Amino acid sequence: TCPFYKKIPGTGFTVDAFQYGVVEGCTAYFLTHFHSDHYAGLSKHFTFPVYCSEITGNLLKNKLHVQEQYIHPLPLDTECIVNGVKVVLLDANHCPGAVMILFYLPNGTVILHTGDFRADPSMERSLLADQKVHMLYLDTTYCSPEYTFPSQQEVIRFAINTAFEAVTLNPHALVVCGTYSIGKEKVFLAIADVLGSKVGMSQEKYKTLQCLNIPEINSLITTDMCSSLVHLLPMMQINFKGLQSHLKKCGGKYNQILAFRPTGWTHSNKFTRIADVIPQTKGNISIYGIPYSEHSSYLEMKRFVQWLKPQKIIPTVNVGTWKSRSTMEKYFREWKLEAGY
């Protein structure tokens, strides 16, 4: 049965609530983004209205085979009416097609549901600034002070420089990037752009990218592995054994691999700046762990919330345990006392 934190009170709306079968009273199902924990339950068998971004709708039609009649795409930064209620979709700074949803309730309450997001100061100059928001449904993935990470730009600059040096030293080196879902495309697109290459991948991954409305995408990607010096592989294959196996498949055209594993936070964020990163190496294979995050850091989340000044916060991540809920409640109260709301 559907949790309270996926329901928007005083509407017939739900958000990311597809795994409970038919939700009693729901007239419109919103989907924030195309990550499987959020879409769980959606398939060609679904027959109720789904509201989402154009990119999310592309993926629902082509990958999950949801019938077109049930897909209702909405543009971004535009006031729209759904079932007699004013809504706005805003860029979440997460993966492609990911949104936050602003609900203007008939009684005058305003609710922001972040979906998954990486808070940014540019959000403080969006439509959110135009009126008071009363309730916030928050992506609390990294709601603890230990969670720091570098900017996306710092990480990309390190990746571009590392790959350019390795391939300039050895023109027979292949670059590999691991992936398991949409998101983090800039890692492999920026590396391929500095090397003057397309990115090579499986037919199933190419199909996914072709749904993302990336300008000039046909000049950037290919299914011809041979012709390209940056390859994508499942994240599970980015280890010494898998990368050796892959090198054997490529018909000797390469004699070395440099690989990237974009992760979330992992314990060592605590000590190491991006400039100090060194790879794990076994023979002619080197692997770099790079902390490229599409969720808010603690400091990013705290800045956004203290600017928004909500009257109530409803967490959407790490809500299954007491301990976790209690810890998050302590931080929200600190933030409120500090900023005076």
Q: How many residues bind Ni ion (CB under 5 A)?
A: 2
Distance CA 118, CA 14 (A): 22
Q: How far is the CB of 207 from Ni ion (least distance, A)?
A: 20
- End-to-end CA distance of the chain, in Å? 34
Nearer to Ni ion, 243 or 294 (CB): 294
User: Does 185 interact with Ni ion (rule: CB under 5 A)?
Assistant: no
Nearer to Ni ion, 116 or 185 (CB): 116
Give the interface segment with Ni ion, choosing from 108-116, 229-237, 243-251, 255-263 (CB under 5 A). Answer: 108-116
| Residue where the block lists tokens 């500090």 | 338
Site string for Ni ion, 60-89 (x = CB under 5 A): ------------------------------
Q: How far is the CB of 142 from Ni ion (least distance, A)?
A: 13
| Residue where the block lists tokens 């300008």 | 215
**CB atoms near residue 262 (< 10 Å):** 23
Nearer to Ni ion, 117 or 331 (CB): 117
Nearer to Ni ion, 116 or 300 (CB): 116
Q: How far is the CB of 38 from Ni ion (least distance, A)?
A: 6
Q: How far is the CB of 209 from Ni ion (least distance, A)?
A: 17
Q: How far is the CB of 2 from Ni ion (least distance, A)?
A: 19
Nearer to Ni ion, 173 or 294 (CB): 294
Q: How far is the CB of 269 from Ni ion (least distance, A)?
A: 19
Give the interface segment with Ni ion, choosing from 31-39, 68-76, 163-171, 187-195 (CB under 5 A). Answer: 31-39
Give the interface segment with Ni ion, choosing from 111-119, 205-213, 227-235, 304-312 (CB under 5 A). Answer: 111-119
Give the interface segment with Ni ion, choosing from 83-91, 116-124, 213-221, 328-336 (CB under 5 A). Answer: 116-124
Q: How far is the CB of 37 from Ni ion (least distance, A)?
A: 7
Q: How far is the CB of 286 from Ni ion (least distance, A)?
A: 29
Among 11, 23, 31, 35, binds Ni ion (CB under 5 A): 35
Site string for Ni ion, 306-325 (x = CB under 5 A): --------------------
Nearer to Ni ion, 58 or 286 (CB): 58
Give how far the C-alpha of residue 317 lies from the chain's centroid of Cα atoms, to the nearest Å: 14
SS3 sequence of the chain: CCCHHHEECCCCEEECCCCCCCCCCCCEEECCCCCHHHHCCCCCCCCCCEEECHHHHHHHHHHHCCCHHHEEECCCCCCEEECCEEEEEEECCCCCCCEEEEEECCCCCEEEECCCCCCCHHHHHCHHHHCCCCEEEECCCCCCCCCCCCCHHHHHHHHHHHHHHHHHHCCCEEEEEEECCCCCHHHHHHHHHHCCCCEECCHHHHHHHCCCCCCCHHHCEECCHHHCCEEEEEHHHCCHHHHHHHHHHCCCCCCEEEEEEEECCCHHHHCCCHHHCCCEEECCEEEEEEECCCCCCHHHHHHHHHHHCCCEEEECCCCCCHHHHHHHHHHHHHHHHHHCC
Among 116, 139, 185, 300, binds Ni ion (CB under 5 A): 116
Give residues in contact with Ni ion (CB under 5 A): 35, 116
